[PDB]
């Protein structure tokens, strides 16, 4: 009554037979914007069916000597589905998300993963250069990876000068290959403004760093994938105009 679960959101469902919990980020639920905190005058739109559903990304192979991956959360979904059309035609965007990262393995594989959300996960440019105009900066396909993700170069500092050891102050879970196979986080809309564009600003970002690397014996399955499914809970848009890709 605690390990089996089903998460029906829209016309999509997620079944699992061994999980641990569902961490609720900062103990709060994704809500609609109240009339007190709102500042825009135009009426917002609410599809409520076509955008609040589980979108599944491509799978990431988990090699033995892997470093990690990271995705921006309002940016992985801009070309896929009706959510990308809504977040390309409109100008303002407010929604929470509902994470789920699956990584199944047999009872003879060992390893663990740390999955977490990092609000305002700013990517740092690597290189010793204390000169404003000569310093290195990350490219556009590194700050905003897209739907194909991006790998870490130094997962020990989260590619931002911040220790991974104390990265447990974030809403997170573990995927221990002996206990569970799925980590899920229900994150609300965290921002300093009530509404914000979904093309220039990426609210937060998932990180999956493989601590205690994958180990197995000969004869077992080598290809161990990693699949993540997102659900934009309580999406609402505003400021309809011409569609802009990026």
């Amino acid at each position: 009554s605690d390990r089996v679960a089903q998460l029906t959101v829209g016309n999509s469902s997620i079944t699992t037979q061994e999980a641990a919990n569902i961490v609720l980020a900062y103990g709060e639920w994704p809500e609609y914007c109240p009339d007190t905190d709102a500042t825009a005058v135009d009426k917002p739109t609410r599809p409520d069916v076509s955008v609040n559903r589980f979108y599944t990304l491509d799978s990431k192979m988990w090699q033995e000597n892997s470093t990690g991956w990271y995705w921006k959360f309002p940016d992985v979904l801009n070309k896929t589905g009706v959510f990308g059309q809504n977040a390309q035609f409109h100008y303002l965007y407010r929604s929470g998300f509902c994470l789920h990262v699956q990584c199944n393995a047999s009872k003879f594989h060992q390893g663990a993963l740390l999955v977490a959300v990092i609000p305002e996960f700013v990517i740092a440019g690597r290189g010793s250069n204390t000169k404003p105009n000569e310093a290195p900066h990350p490219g556009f396909t590194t700050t905003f990876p897209g739907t194909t993700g991006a790998t870490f170069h130094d997962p020990y500092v989260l590619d931002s000068g911040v220790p991974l050891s104390q990265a447990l102050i974030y809403p997170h879970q573990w995927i221990n290959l002996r206990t569970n196979n799925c980590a899920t986080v229900i994150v609300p809309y965290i921002n300093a403004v009530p509404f914000d564009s979904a093309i220039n600003h990426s609210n937060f970002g998932l990180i999956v760093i493989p601590v205690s690397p994958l180990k197995y014996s000969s004869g077992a399955t080598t290809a161990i994938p990693i699949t993540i499914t997102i659900a934009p809970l309580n999406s609402e848009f505003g400021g309809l105009r011409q569609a802009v890709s990026q």
Partner: protein, 270 residues
């Protein structure tokens, strides 16, 4: 929500000899901190704790003055300083402990001389908001300050001190901004505008010596900022790597400093 001072006291406990009640076996795979306390593991006594925790709020932790910037005036005639408190690594790390912060401020101006003294001259401090014209000379018309707030103080006076409100267009100051300020084709080589929040640009701080001819002194005014009425949101880990730039969280690829000093073996506590 509980509101109390001191510290949670302990209660008397005895030994437990039964099955099914296991307070020690936790499960960290759920992303929750363990809730096992003193009384359930070991036999304990009763104590009444009086160790006040008033000094651990985020309003007593930040309400302490601290150097934010230094302004060298040669006497070009004047000197400017773009207001950004992320220039000295002492008050930058405490503010970067958090993601969003909403607070009032209180700046203190301490001006000295080259060798260190206080000659009875006069100084004008002028705050230039975003959009107001910066002064182009020591006897320009911008110094008429018909609307800009200015302070006229001497070197032989106590250090000047003003109070500054929350002057941001957003609802809070964010130090980390995961995005670009504008639309368009962003480059792959030199993203010189990534992680630049426009809600934190507060203007320019100018200073001149009120005179007609040129005074032959090289001054140096230090700005000491203190935070008050501070609210904080979304805590985040404290930085361990040395700072390189001022507006960017750049670190060094090689020679990454470990977050714990080395010892001989893993089976030797000392």
């Amino acid at each position: 929500v509980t509101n109390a001072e001191s510290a949670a006291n302990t209660t008397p406990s005895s030994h437990r000899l039964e099955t099914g009640r296991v307070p020690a076996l936790q499960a960290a795979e759920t992303g929750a901190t363990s809730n096992a306390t003193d009384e359930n593991m070991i036999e304990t006594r009763c104590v009444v704790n009086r160790n006040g925790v008033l000094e651990t709020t985020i309003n007593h932790f930040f309400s302490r003055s601290g150097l934010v910037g230094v302004v060298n005036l040669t006497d070009t005639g004047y000197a400017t300083w773009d207001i950004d408190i992320m220039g000295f690594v002492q008050l930058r790390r405490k503010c970067e402990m958090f993601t969003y912060m909403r607070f009032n401020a209180e700046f203190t101006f301490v001006t000295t001389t080259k060798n260190g003294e206080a000659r009875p001259y006069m100084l004008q401090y002028m705050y230039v908001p975003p959009g107001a014209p910066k002064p182009t000379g020591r006897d320009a018309f911008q110094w008429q300050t018909a609307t800009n707030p200015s302070v006229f103080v001497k070197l032989t006076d106590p250090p000047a001190q003003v109070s500054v409100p929350f002057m941001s267009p957003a609802s809070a100051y964010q130090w980390f901004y995961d995005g670009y300020p504008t639309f368009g084709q962003h480059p792959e080589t030199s993203n010189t505008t990534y992680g630049l929040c426009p809600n934190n640009m507060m203007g320019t701080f100018a200073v001149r010596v009120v005179s007609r001819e040129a005074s032959q002194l090289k001054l140096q005014t230090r700005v000491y900022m203190k935070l008050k009425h501070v609210r904080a949101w979304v805590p985040r880990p404290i930085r361990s790597q040395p700072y390189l730039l001022k507006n960017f969280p750049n670190y060094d690829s090689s020679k990454i400093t470990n977050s714990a000093r080395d010892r001989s073996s893993i089976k030797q506590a000392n």
